[PDB]
Design a protein around this ligand. Structure first.
Ligand SMILES: CN(C)S(=O)(=O)C[C@H]1CCCN(C(=O)c2c[nH]c3c(F)c(F)c(F)c(F)c23)C1
Length: 128
């Protein structure tokens, strides 16, 4: 029987291979072993976003945030999901929160978060 961490790594590898439902199922098996690890929910949320399952992605972000309020990924994925759902004000605030958390945690995503913010703010401006 695989361990929870082995299933998380298998899901991560399947995600790199663009096998999104298969990766999401691996994270579900990891959650069966240990449902108190935020990263299983953040990683599954991005799978759901890639599968256009926005409501399921939002729910996994909420499960992750109840376990790790400092999660850069949960805020970033929540913001990207809200952007796709046209919830622009919410998306921008979550992306800005991911930026602040990433800076406080010394995480390096290059210019991804400011670029995502401009994409979100430009899309918001174009809609209004
Ligand atoms: C499903 N999983 C295999 S996963 O681990 O969620 C895979 C992710 C790993 C990190 C990089 N990925 C990204 O999509 C990011 C690209 N830019 C980011 C960024 F600026 C962030 F703030 C952030 F939180 C991110 F996750 C990303 C993939």
């Amino acid at each position: 029987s695989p361990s929870a961490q082995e299933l998380k790594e298998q899901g991560n590898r399947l995600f790199v291979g663009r096998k999104y439902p298969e990766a999401a199922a691996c994270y579900g098996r990891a959650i069966t072993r240990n449902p108190l690890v935020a990263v299983y929910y953040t990683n599954r949320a991005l799978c759901y976003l890639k599968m256009q399952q926005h409501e399921q992605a939002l729910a996994d972000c909420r499960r992750a945030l109840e376990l790790d309020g400092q999660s850069v990924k949960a805020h970033f994925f929540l913001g990207q999901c809200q952007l796709e759902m046209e919830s622009y004000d919410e998306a921008i605030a979550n992306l800005q929160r991911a930026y602040s958390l990433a800076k406080e945690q010394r995480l390096n995503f290059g210019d991804d978060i400011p670029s995502a913010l401009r994409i979100a703010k430009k899309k918001r401006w174009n809609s209004i």
